[PDB]
Amino acid sequence: YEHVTVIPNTVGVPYKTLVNRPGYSPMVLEMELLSVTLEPTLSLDYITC
Amino acid sequence: YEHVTVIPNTVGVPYKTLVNRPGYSPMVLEMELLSVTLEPTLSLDYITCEYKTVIPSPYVKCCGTAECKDKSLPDYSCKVFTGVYPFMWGGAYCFCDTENTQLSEAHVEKSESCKTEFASAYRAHTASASAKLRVLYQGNNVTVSAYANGDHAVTVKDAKFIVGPMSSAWTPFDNKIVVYKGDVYNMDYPPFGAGRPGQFGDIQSRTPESEDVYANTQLVLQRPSAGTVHVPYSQAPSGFKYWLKERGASLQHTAPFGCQIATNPVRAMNCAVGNMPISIDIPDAAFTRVVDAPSLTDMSCEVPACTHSSDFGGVAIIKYAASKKGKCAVHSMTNAVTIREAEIEVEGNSQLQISFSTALASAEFRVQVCSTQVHCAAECHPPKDHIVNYPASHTTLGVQDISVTAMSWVQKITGGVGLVVAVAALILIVVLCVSFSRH
Amino acid sequence: TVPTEGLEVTWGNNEPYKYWPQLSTNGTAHGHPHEIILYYYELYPTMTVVVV
Ligand SMILES: *[C@@H]1O[C@H](CO)[C@@H](O)[C@H](O)[C@H]1NC(C)=O
């Protein structure tokens, strides 16, 4: 049912997880991170031309 | 055979049971009650309908004074008021002013409201244990409805049955109960002829067509001032203008045991407490011999994963070897485990599964298959979910609840100090004998 | 607050709702330490806590 995992922060490496509910046959799924883009919040102080 | 059993009077739970016929496959059968409908004894006491004050057209005794004749009316009131003076467009309707007196009479009677608007004060005592039960006999859902008394066994399709009667004779009702057309109230009323003026049911009658009207309105006729050619009088309080406010919740919410309300007539609904005896005879045509049953060997059972949930969070795997093709009576012998499946078609060397649970973690248990004992272990788990919108079945247990390793832990702690008590015993005998070694 | 019996709640004209708890589940382990108060907090907590 619910499945919480903590995968390592890896760009471009897959992860196999053993998802399984209590009572049924297990399953292995693949997830993958592709990008971790950190957008900084900004404010212009002044310019120079 | 005939088989008699008593199930706990519990609304909405599948009851599975074994019917042992030795020399035959034991008829395991599933039946479940649906309705618990009680109907108390029918005894109307009296009625309370909305009265009205009847002020007849009074008597202006112009230029004279008369007496006060009393009629047999409920809350009768009459008074010759002197000093009156009538007004119209022409002013003085009487000729003079001083000698004009005026008779004033009024009382109270019923209204036309009483054909529909009323309320029965009512006496309620012992009820009719009526009910409904559905048996899934051999893939056949047969549902019957009858009263649980002890003699009225009803028979359909090789199955006679008498449900009950009810052991726990608790009722939500008492003797005193007032009823209006959408709502019942197990409250004390004043008896007929005993209504205090201004009270709940202060107007009293037996039926909506009884001409007797016991009334109490404490009424008194005050004096008109001057020229107010009418009857100023006191207040006659109706109980029915506050027949709503005192009600609060009705008895759909005051009842215990999940008991509900049916009106006209008032049936108590599904009030699960106690237990009900059912007794059913089916002859041997529904009973297959053990030699006519495919005998199972290789009773190798296990569970992939169990979970002591509310529902069937365990499902176990039976690998087996029957002799031949045919049905098999599968059965949970212990009340801790509730298999949800009655009988399974078994072929031979094959494998299937079974849906069940308990409320504990390590259920170790012997199922019964083609009259065959099989042991099997089950590690169940605490289920993830937390709210349940339905009662469970197998959870009817006690405190002696077996575990996974607290068995081993209690074995570890009983392997504690009692051995040191054996040490204490050897110290005691060795200090005894050396004291006896002196002489 | 839901009892071990379960609770009815009605609201307005719509039909009430009947509720049952589980066994105070998921406070569970066995472990190389005790974790038997954990199993107890499954196995009917706060009653027969005195017995151990
Ligand atoms: C019989 O009734 C049960 C509920 O009592 C239901 O789940 C089942 O599907 C029914 N089966 C048949 C064959 O009518």
From TrEMBL, chain A:
It is found in: Host Golgi apparatus, Host trans-Golgi network; Host cell membrane; Host cytoplasm; Host endoplasmic reticulum. Provides the signal sequence for the translocation of the precursor of protein E3/E2 to the host endoplasmic reticulum. Furin-cleaved E3 remains associated with spike glycoprotein E1 and mediates pH protection of the latter during the transport via the secretory pathway. After virion release from the host cell, the assembly protein E3 is gradually released in the extracellular space. Homodimer. Homomultimer. Interacts with host karyopherin KPNA4; this interaction allows the nuclear import of the viral capsid protein. Interacts with spike glycoprotein E2. Interacts with host IRAK1; the interaction leads to inhibition of IRAK1-dependent signaling. This is Structural polyprotein. It comes from Chikungunya virus (CHIKV).
